Every structure is written in structure tokens, then in C-alpha cells.
């Protein structure tokens, strides 16, 4: 025994045989099984290990080969989005490391400007 479609929903098949879901209450359709929202991780962060988050699909096409479908953003891509996500997380920490280095470097300059201003205030003052 499986789990029922939530109230108002129906399952159907597109011309190519791909299953889709019909929400009669809101008069829309979706490639995403409405029961997935109770099971699947919502973001790549919540995934373990190889799982795809909600609204992502593997697909294939003879022209392009294996690719990925994101029903969340209504885009398709070649690159594995799980790989891409791990890469994005490292790049962000790298970026934060780099702006910390630049912030430190610029404050060193400010500090040195301030000690130059102290010297000038000393000169002006010792002119009495």
C-alpha cells in the first residue's frame, strides 16, 4: 500500500509518458509529486548523501546526455548540482577569507595614516 495524493490532486501522464501532477484546487500542474515535500530534503544542505533535494530531477537526452532539471527555478544544467553546491560553499569561505585579508590590509593603512596625523598634530602643537 502506498500514500494517497493529497486532497484536490490527481496524477496524469504527458504525451511522452512522463508523470505529472494536477492540483484542481488551485488549477495548476506540477512535475513534482506533491508527496515529495514530506520526504525529500529541501536544500542541498539537508542532503545525505547522493540524494537530490525537492524539485530536482535527473534526466537524459541523446543530444546532450545526462543532465539535471530544477523545477524550483525552471532551469536545466549539465553540471551535477550537488558537486556545484559543495564547490559554492568552499568558494564562499574563500571569498570571506579574502575580504578579511583586504579589510585587514586597508585598516593597516588607516592606522598608519592616523599615526602620521598624530605626528602633524605634534608639530603644529610644538610650534608654540
Amino acid at each position: 500500500f502506498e500514500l494517497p495524493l493529497p486532497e484536490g490532486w490527481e496524477e496524469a501522464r504527458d504525451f511522452d509518458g512522463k508523470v505529472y501532477y494536477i492540483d484542481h484546487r488551485n488549477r495548476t500542474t506540477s512535475w513534482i509529486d506533491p508527496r515529495d515535500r514530506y520526504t525529500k530534503p529541501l536544500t542541498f544542505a539537508d542532503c545525505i548523501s547522493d540524494e537530490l533535494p525537492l524539485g530536482w530531477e535527473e534526466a537524459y537526452d541523446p543530444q546532450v546526455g545526462d543532465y539535471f532539471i530544477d523545477h524550483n527555478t525552471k532551469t536545466t544544467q549539465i553540471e551535477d548540482p550537488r558537486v556545484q553546491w559543495r564547490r559554492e560553499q568552499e568558494h564562499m569561505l574563500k571569498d570571506y577569507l579574502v575580504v578579511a585579508q583586504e579589510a585587514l590590509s586597508a585598516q593597516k593603512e588607516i592606522y598608519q595614516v592616523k599615526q602620521q596625523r598624530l605626528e602633524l598634530a605634534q608639530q603644529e602643537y610644538q610650534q608654540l
Binding site: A12, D14, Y20, Y21, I22, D23, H24, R27, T28, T29, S30, W31, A59, D61, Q63, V64, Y67, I69, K74, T75, T76, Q77, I78
Partner: peptide, 17 residues
């Protein structure tokens, strides 16, 4: 992505019972 990249296919239009 390639130049012949498969574009996003939206789900079929809503249709009553």
C-alpha cells in the same frame, strides 16, 4: 551548458476533469 542545451520543459497546462 552546450549550445544545443535542452531548455526547461514546463508541466502540461491545467485542464479540468
Amino acid at each position: 551548458r552546450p549550445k544545443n542545451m535542452t531548455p526547461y520543459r514546463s508541466p502540461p497546462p491545467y485542464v479540468p476533469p
